[PDB]
């Protein structure tokens, strides 16, 4: 609901301050992005994002992110790209990784 704010007191958590209706509005669940922004009367109207698009934090952005295209060959996905997470590629099955990177490392090695 469009909770009317009062100067000297901030909005509660899970509520942002729209600067078009000048009134506090709610923040909806991760994995769904605001299709129609908050207005004086209407609250946030947010719709789930499409495939390979996620949002891990309570958002109001009009567009989600994008996961990786593919893990190519000999790389099993260790975490599927659902609505609240990424596509973390990793090493080959039956091997391990000795290097490191942001998500999937740069040098594998046999399981010894």
């Amino acid at each position, epitope marked *: 609901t469009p909770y009317a*704010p009062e100067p000297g007191s901030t909005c509660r958590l899970r509520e942002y*301050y729209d600067q078009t209706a000048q009134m506090c509005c709610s923040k909806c669940s991760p994995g769904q992005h605001a299709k129609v*922004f908050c207005t004086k009367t209407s609250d946030t109207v947010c719709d789930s994002c499409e495939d390979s698009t996620y949002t891990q934090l309570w958002n109001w952005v009009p567009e989600c992110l994008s996961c990786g295209s593919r893990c190519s060959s000999d790389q099993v996905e260790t975490q599927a790209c659902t609505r609240e997470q990424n596509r973390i590629c990793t090493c080959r099955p039956g091997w391990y990784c000795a290097l490191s990177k942001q998500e999937g490392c740069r040098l594998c090695a046999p399981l010894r």
Partner: antibody, heavy 117, light 112 residues
Framework: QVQLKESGPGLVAPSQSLSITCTVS????????VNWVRQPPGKGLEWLGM???????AYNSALKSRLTITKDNSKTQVFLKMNSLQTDDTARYYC???????????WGQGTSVTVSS | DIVLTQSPTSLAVSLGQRATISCRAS??????????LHWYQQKPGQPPILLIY???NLDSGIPARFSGSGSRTDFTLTINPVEADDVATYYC?????????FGGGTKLEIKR
């Protein structure tokens, strides 16, 4: 996807009418506000007027009586008309969009308006 | 209206080193909760792109090497690693009272 095309006359004489048109695609103007930004060559940006979805517009402090920002919502356009062009108003005019609570995200390439004779 | 002064106005930092900017404000731009500031970046010729869109909130799809902080008057945008293509002009905009005023901005250069 989101795309904003900015079009304007390349050269206009001093004290002549100026008209820019920004065509938007990928979002609905009924809820999204488009505002203009200007940049003299080699200088920092200086803000310009904005128009919300409803139609109410805010303007600048020193150009409050020079800009006539209006909208054609059905045609999905934002066209700006400006008068009394002094020689110092030579700059680039970027269209933009406030898709994130006025945190400007998407911009269009400017037309680099020049004022000379 | 609000006046913003950017310190410095031109700096050169080699690749991989830290950089720091400060967009000092004449008036407390903190309306509710956290301060309302923006930190747009404009590459040479390219239209400006958004990064750090509310005091410290980071835009969706921007490298994590940026950061935001500060409130009331003091403000800081930190790029701890500086890559080769992080050469642009970094600006600052407040989103509290009409009209919103930009600043002179910086010019981050590379000393190779």
């Amino acid at each position: 996807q989101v795309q904003l095309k900015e079009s304007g006359p390349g050269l206009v004489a001093p004290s002549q009418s100026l008209s820019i048109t920004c065509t938007v695609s990928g979002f609905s103007l009924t809820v999204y506000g488009v505002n203009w930004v200007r940049q003299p060559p080699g200088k920092g940006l200086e803000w310009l007027g904005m128009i919300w979805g409803d139609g109410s517009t805010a303007y600048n402090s020193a150009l409050k009586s020079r800009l006539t920002i209006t909208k054609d919502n059905s045609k999905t356009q934002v066209f700006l008309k400006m008068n009394s062009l002094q020689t110092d108003d030579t700059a680039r005019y970027y269209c933009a969009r406030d898709g994130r609570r006025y945190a400007l995200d998407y911009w269009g390439q400017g037309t680099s308006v020049t004022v000379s004779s | 209206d609000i006046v913003l002064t950017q310190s410095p106005t031109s700096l050169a930092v080699s690749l991989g080193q830290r950089a720091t900017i400060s967009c000092r404000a004449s008036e407390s731009v903190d309306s509710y909760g956290d301060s309302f500031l923006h930190w747009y970046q404009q590459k040479p010729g390219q239209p400006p792109i958004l990064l750090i869109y509310r005091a410290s909130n980071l835009d969706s799809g921007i490298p994590a090497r940026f950061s935001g902080s500060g409130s009331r008057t003091d403000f800081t945008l930190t790029i701890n690693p500086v890559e080769a293509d992080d050469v642009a002009t970094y600006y600052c905009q407040q989103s509290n009272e009409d009209p919103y005023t930009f600043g002179g901005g910086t010019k981050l250069e590379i000393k190779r």
